[PDB]
């Protein structure tokens, strides 16, 4: 979504993020994700990948590379080498 292209815009969507979820808005927004307003469902502004069921210790960048490795925002921020590693390529 076009209005979620900035980190600050994505941070504003976490207004009603449930406080019990063990991952923080700053981590999520940095990795491209904004809150869609249901449970702990987030989506990437670039690739539209959705992630939910966040667990203690999850790193949103690693999860983004695990499930949505072709995302261009992810590749530009973290690099193809990182994404390849998370996909089991060295």
């Amino acid at each position: 979504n076009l209005s979620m292209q900035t980190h600050a815009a994505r941070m504003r969507t976490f207004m009603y993020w449930p406080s019990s979820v063990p991952v923080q808005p700053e981590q999520l927004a940095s990795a491209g994700f904004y809150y869609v307003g249901r449970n702990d469902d987030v989506k990437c502004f670039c690739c539209d990948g959705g992630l939910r069921c966040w667990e203690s210790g999850d790193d949103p960048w690693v999860e983004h590379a695990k499930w949505f490795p072709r995302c261009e925002f992810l590749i530009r921020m973290k690099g193809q080498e990182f994404v390849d590693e998370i996909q089991g390529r060295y």
């Binding site: 991952v23 992630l51 939910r52 069921c53 966040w54 999860e63 499930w67 949505f68």
Partner: peptide, 4 residues
């Protein structure tokens, strides 16, 4: 996390 899990994808959708």
């Amino acid at each position: 996390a899990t994808p959708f």
